[PDB]
Ligand binder design. Structure first.
Ligand SMILES: Cc1nc(-c2ccc(S(=O)(=O)NC(=O)Nc3ncc(Br)s3)cc2)cs1
Ligand SMILES: Cc1nc(-c2ccc(S(=O)(=O)NC(=O)Nc3ncc(Br)s3)cc2)cs1
Ligand SMILES: Cc1nc(-c2ccc(S(=O)(=O)NC(=O)Nc3ncc(Br)s3)cc2)cs1
Ligand SMILES: Cc1nc(-c2ccc(S(=O)(=O)NC(=O)Nc3ncc(Br)s3)cc2)cs1
Lengths: 317, 319, 317, 318
């Protein structure tokens, strides 16, 4: 029996007897995602080229304005904005949203896959809302996921009930539920990172990579895949299994990806799917942030693959 | 002044005073591509999941390309990645062109929504014999037109002909390919290398040396970045747009590479060379290989000319 | 501040502190309507004509299956089905829905406007669901409206709070609120009926129309419009004012249009917009039905116009 | 075997061994029509209502004007939206003259009534410098004419010397698919179409003819009545279902209401190529020699038997 994202979320929200605010949040977010998808696939591009005589900016505006007008949020943190955005009192709800409106858009000139990442916290304190309300560890997440604008558009939504995948049918502008209660493979056959930085690798990374090319137990070498867009690489990791790494290097001694709106949502999706996500020293979701734009190293994916990396890492202290 | 793919092609064809057959070819090809794009983006998927109470995409794409080319009255021999033998067009629909295509390259991993694409190469039938598979056994040098459609974050048709390379963006609101990049030229040297390094234990020694030169530059230069989508159209297109180098080389286990010459290597080599880039097997230009089997494989290394030349120096250094 | 149908209905539903079932129903119907629109605009027709080598039934299937799977309905009455459709026990909700899935589709070969008409009732008794639960007078309506597949696609939704109009943005599949709390003109300048059947007119109908063409005073005659598709004609009546008639005559003493899923929803929209809708003998919404497919004469529109018709109608009674 | 509009026109163009200029015109027009369709169906309206924080008839006119100019096929363009004819700049001049109504019926688009685009295409006949006079040709001189109907779906009807062909816009791929080949209208229909709101102004022939439709003197069944009020919608129904369409003169419109250059002549061309008729009462619409690009004309068109029946009544009243 068919189901849509909005209907699925309403049915779960009613079972839980919530106020409805989270459903309003998510529905508004979905409206923003469908709007971004339409622009990313270049609907209307003919008008820009004169038929009748920016993209990361528009995506950010779409998310900001739909979340503000949902009456469900109070603090908004985006990759695009230096400081947290405080929702005006007459539109304030109880939820905090950290998002990357068009992740990977730096290389969008080659039509690489792009996406939107989001993580949702409930505001905890009785104080007036402020940037400090976004400085929660990932354990505190209420919901997280991403929209992938790849060969098709897909929304992956992780909540405490698990992970579910919804395909955008653009003929009717509806997210169709296509993969329920998704679990990642225990172990995969693909590893994913920028090997251009081989010169800067920690020794633990270098050894782990050598095990994938020259397997010590006589198994077959892993394949290598690296789109260079986090949402595409993570979603392949979810679908086919395997492991994704953005460890520390010389240009990025704390890694390059951002903790609040890149690492935490993907880590949350992995763990709800039976996967893992580590910085090397701890779980990503346990990192207590002190800066909304702070960076974090990330290694995630199938549990056997991450655990193997952690064994190698532990060997190097 | 705005321009669309069809009109751009009509204006060039009229200037050249051709019969119109090639324009009819290209127009039918674009229609199948618009149909492929719509299925790839999962238009109508709600019906598969029971909203009202079916072929895999590579099968449907092959049917779309096949049926539009046959019904274009411009073709006589069609080679597809999907079919063991060439298709001979029925006499009442026969035109003068030979088309080799890959209808949905990269679709094996479309379950993760990776970029996919369509690759095509167009030849003039040269012999006066009855049309046959032998008419597709032409070297890449003989191509009249070649290109690809990339179904990525957006859909783009790249069309290379003797006049150069032009890029057309599909506006899905109106189903028209909008001309957005005219007479495109690749960077002389790039900063990205692209290949499956998981198989490093099987690398040819020249591939091992060249890749290490990229990671640990001997001249104190900055190392290159690495990108490998695993879908040829996406990787080659990034190579065209940002410059750099793409490798699917031969090794001991794969002495002739993995990619297919007629409808993967030749069309991309033609696009590269028209953009001021290069494309080599290691031993020669890809477009100079004289094929003997429509599904034969070929090693390919392509991209910015300085990068390809650097590879070829290393390849020669290993005798 | 932008608003969509889903967001608008959730917000009223929260103010009203309801269980959420009605919001679930309407969201499901909305999805069916987007699906009908896509098929009506002939998306994918290329495949029907061989590029790779019914419409009213499909629309009926879309509505039936979306409503059944909403867990909000228990009895479904459609123009397309001889008997009421009883929702299976494990999916039964509290609402009764009467609809015409593709009204006007008889002339769809000429690309005429078509539409979907719906009316929603609360099941009143605790008995086992049966056709009898749909035999409520239009006065009992919880919500009613229509979707018009015209030059664009619009959903007109009438409830106790008034009538609101939503434009389908097909680029993102969202119904945008574009006209809030709409009211009909007190008096209009357009009359609408099939004059080809003039020889069968009731004598009061003949006189009233003659007064529209040959006003006994010094005013200008009314204009005439008749699309032949009820959703199209009633929506024009709502937007521009005026009067729409499908009256009774000697050969059709009860009219031809159907009460449960054409006359009552349109009469309800009219009354919530400050209009009127009469059979000649009483308000349409006061008719107590005895058969789910029963017919009812209907005259509706701007109140001064409807009241003028009743004046002429009394003279011949 | 499937066929599209562009493919259908090229194949006929190759057979005719013409230069390609008309094919270039028509392809450009079809591109503007798809852009109009997308706008008319309100794609992107969410942005106009603030999702991120031109009137339709003006936009449509811009789309046709700019696509035809850039086609290198036209020299004089006449539009319902512009007071004077537009002369194409010299470096873009081709041989064709185009009269069009970019969004006919848009006056009542607030109620989502069907709207449409009407076009008629002429070869420039005079060798003088291009000017407004190059559009003052009788409809008999048309090379191509037709319309796009933005109704429940979008359909393009194309009439040429070879006959009338109907193409359905599949919005999933932005392609016009051939769905009705070489269309012929019914010899006689059962629907008449006109604004009876002007009954007090009808001349006696119109009054008698309508009375014959409601009270048939042969005791046959009355015709049904339909009047959308949008010309493209009413004419298309007439073409598909047969019957008769009327917009006669009245007191507000002593020379008729509909426009000769880009409403009456193109529909008259489509009707006659479909085996129908289209008359002013005094002569065939296509025989009227215009003197002013926006001049009006009375029109009665549709199935041949129905028009011929009207003309007998017209003859009876002298
Ligand atoms: C996939 C999953 N979703 C949830 C979930 C979603 C939303 C909430 S909520 O707090 O927003 N409550 C809420 O919406 N109630 C409602 N009343 C009427 C309507 Br209609 S929806 C609570 C839980 C849990 S697992
Ligand atoms: C981008 C470029 N395209 C070409 C090109 C394209 C097509 C041809 S052709 O042989 O097909 N001739 C042809 O179509 N003539 C025509 N007659 C009437 C119409 Br309308 S089009 C020849 C050259 C060269 S560079
Ligand atoms: C336009 C208008 N709509 C209504 C209306 C609609 C639905 C209902 S309801 O009974 O379904 N309750 C309901 O949905 N509660 C909710 N809780 C949380 C969320 Br999120 S929605 C009640 C009233 C009145 S005027
Ligand atoms: C449906 C119908 N269309 C016509 C028709 C259309 C266009 C012309 S034309 O003068 O433009 N010539 C022309 O296009 N030649 C071409 N050669 C190759 C290509 Br490719 S196009 C002439 C006649 C007649 S009935």
């Amino acid at each position: 029996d068919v189901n849509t994202l909005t209907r699925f979320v309403m049915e779960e929200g009613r079972k839980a007897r919530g106020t409805g605010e989270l459903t309003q949040l998510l529905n508004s977010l979905c409206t923003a995602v469908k709007a971004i998808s339409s622009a990313v696939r270049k609907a209307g591009i003919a008008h820009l080229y004169g038929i009748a005589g920016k993209l990361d900016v528009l995506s950010n505006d779409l998310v900001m304005n739909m979340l503000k007008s949902s009456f469900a949020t109070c603090v908004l943190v985006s990759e695009e904005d230096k400081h947290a955005i405080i929702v005006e009192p007459e539109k304030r709800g109880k939820y905090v949203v950290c998002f990357d409106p068009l992740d990977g858009s730096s290389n969008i000139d080659c039509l690489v896959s792009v996406g939107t990442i989001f993580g949702i916290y409930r505001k905890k304190s009785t104080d007036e809302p402020s940037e400090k309300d976004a400085l929660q560890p990932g354990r505190n997440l209420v919901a997280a996921g991403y929209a992938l604008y790849g060969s098709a558009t897909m929304l992956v939504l992780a909540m405490d009930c698990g992970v579910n995948c919804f395909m955008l049918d653009p003929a009717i502008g509806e997210f169709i539920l296509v993969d329920k209660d998704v679990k990642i493979k225990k172990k995969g056959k693909i590893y994913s990172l920028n090997e251009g930085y081989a010169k800067d690798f920690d020794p633990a990374v270098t050894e782990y990579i050598q095990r994938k090319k020259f397997p010590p137990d006589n198994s077959a070498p892993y394949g290598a895949r690296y789109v260079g867009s986090m949402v595409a690489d993570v979603h392949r990791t979810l679908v086919y299994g395997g492991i994704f790494l953005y460890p520390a290097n010389k240009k990025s001694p704390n890694g390059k990806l951002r903790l609040l709106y890149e690492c935490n949502p993907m880590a949350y999706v992995m763990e709800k799917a039976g996967g893992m996500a580590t910085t090397g020293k701890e779980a990503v979701l346990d990192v207590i942030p002190t800066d909304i734009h702070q960076r974090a190293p990330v290694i995630l994916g199938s549990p056997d693959d991450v655990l193997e990396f952690l064994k190698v890492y532990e060997k190097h202290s």
